Design a protein around this ligand. Sequence first.
Ligand SMILES: CCCCCCCCCCCCO[C@@H]1O[C@H](CO)[C@@H](O[C@H]2O[C@H](CO)[C@@H](O)[C@H](O)[C@H]2O)[C@H](O)[C@H]1O
Ligand SMILES: CCCCCCCCCCCCO[C@@H]1O[C@H](CO)[C@@H](O[C@H]2O[C@H](CO)[C@@H](O)[C@H](O)[C@H]2O)[C@H](O)[C@H]1O
Ligand SMILES: CCCCCCCCCCCCO[C@@H]1O[C@H](CO)[C@@H](O[C@H]2O[C@H](CO)[C@@H](O)[C@H](O)[C@H]2O)[C@H](O)[C@H]1O
Lengths: 240, 179, 49
Amino acid sequence: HEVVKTLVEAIILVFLVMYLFLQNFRATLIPTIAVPVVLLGTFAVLAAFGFSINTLTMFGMVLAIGLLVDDAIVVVENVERVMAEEGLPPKEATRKSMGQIQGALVGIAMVLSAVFVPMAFFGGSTGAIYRQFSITIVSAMALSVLVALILTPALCATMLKPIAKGDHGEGKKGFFGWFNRMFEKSTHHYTDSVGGILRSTGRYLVLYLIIVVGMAYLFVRLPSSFLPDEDQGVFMTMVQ
Amino acid sequence: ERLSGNQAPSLYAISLIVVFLCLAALYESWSIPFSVMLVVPLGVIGALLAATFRGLTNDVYFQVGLLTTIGLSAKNAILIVEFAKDLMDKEGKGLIEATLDAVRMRLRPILMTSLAFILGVMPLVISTGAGSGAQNAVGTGVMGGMVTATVLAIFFVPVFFVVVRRRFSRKNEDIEHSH
Amino acid sequence: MPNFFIDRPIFAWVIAIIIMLAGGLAILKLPVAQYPTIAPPAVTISASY
Ligand SMILES: CCCCCCCCCCCCO[C@@H]1O[C@H](CO)[C@@H](O[C@H]2O[C@H](CO)[C@@H](O)[C@H](O)[C@H]2O)[C@H](O)[C@H]1O
Ligand SMILES: CCCCCCCCCCCCO[C@@H]1O[C@H](CO)[C@@H](O[C@H]2O[C@H](CO)[C@@H](O)[C@H](O)[C@H]2O)[C@H](O)[C@H]1O
Ligand SMILES: CCCCCCCCCCCCO[C@@H]1O[C@H](CO)[C@@H](O[C@H]2O[C@H](CO)[C@@H](O)[C@H](O)[C@H]2O)[C@H](O)[C@H]1O
């Protein structure tokens, strides 16, 4: 239940970040609907494939939220990007948007399952623990792709406030105005710098190699364990 | 044991193989996957940075949330180069231009998913009480991994691409395509 | 579909490498025996007097 509560919260925290970037209830209500659709879907799958609601499956849902919201964000954001580049009605934009990212979405769902599925193949004791995540997460992101080209575009087509050419929202007064005016300006500096660092190549390869070094280091020094020893609120005393 | 332990190194090998293969098929290339595969360490560095900092172990919960970070990192990489590549094919733009134009298109959605997810798992790292140990492990790893993935990658992916394009160009580059 | 892969030779190759890798891993896990279980099953009641 304590994990459950965290899902509920993370969804609520997600919906807040969304409101920030997306600027409008109905827009940000889109990725908010997607996440529990998939999560609930996953509980269906688990039940079919014969699993149970356990600590690992639950965390699986939890971790799934990142993968889920990204499918949703990617779709909504794209449509919104289109509406500002090329000033288009909602239905039109999503219709050309989904054409433009549908491939990547199904492609990626595969590349990713390559990083989760192998987990389902550990052997003995260790195996079953890891298998739980593997099916859950893989299931959950299948539903996510499926949902992202069945429901997300429908929602994106209906519920999106039309955006005009160049209306990046720098113009509206109030805090959202600042954030948009800041983001726009911040964006430029981001490419102004990437424009710059690209000119060198060299200096950043070593920088990268440093990171690889450090990673290797921090990893080989960091200890290992299976599962933490939770305070169960009970314990034993033995007398000999 | 008993009866064989330590099987993961082998599975992450086929895993790192199948991942390249799929990406190879996705980009219709053997050379481009590298400008996605190279983002893997940009999130591990942060997952590690955190678990040590906070005094954690490499446990089942740390591992799984590491992948989740690897996945999202990879996805964002994938979409950036997908966007850059499709700007030198569908339109006819140069390497630097295709990269820049792609990477600004992809910046908003990435900050979007990062903040929402990091913030989203904050309840876990902050958590105390029942099941806390679990929640803290899962949450700390992902939190660190997601921070360093975001900040590192968005300045590293643009590089990976333009670097691997240049080590595997065939004299048809670079200036500007048409048509 | 074939016209698909006449344009995407890597994608063609990739599918092959995966099917093969899969089989490779299969060869290791797989049991080895002379025949599959092909006798019928039996149960025997033993008593002593
Ligand atoms: C909404 C977005 C996604 C998040 C949803 C995830 C929910 C996680 C639920 C797991 C919690 C554990 O507890 C679970 O709760 C349900 C419902 O109260 C219990 O259900 C119980 O109560 C009802 C009473 O009306 C009985 O009819 C039922 O037979 C009984 O099992 C289950 O016995 C238990 O398995
Ligand atoms: C176990 C047996 C083997 C099964 C393994 C299956 C392989 C899956 C690995 C990754 C799949 C890649 O996914 C697919 O890649 C191709 C790459 O040209 C993309 O194709 C996209 O780009 C090309 C041109 O650039 C278009 O002509 C195409 O119509 C379009 O959809 C697809 O949008 C995507 O869905
Ligand atoms: C690009 C594809 C993505 C994959 C990249 C992989 C990089 C890191 C991801 C996960 C981290 C690896 O996690 C690794 O798991 C195994 C198995 O539990 C650990 O192994 C350790 O714990 C277990 C269980 O007590 C034992 O099997 C083993 O004897 C011991 O050495 C490793 O010490 C750990 O480092």
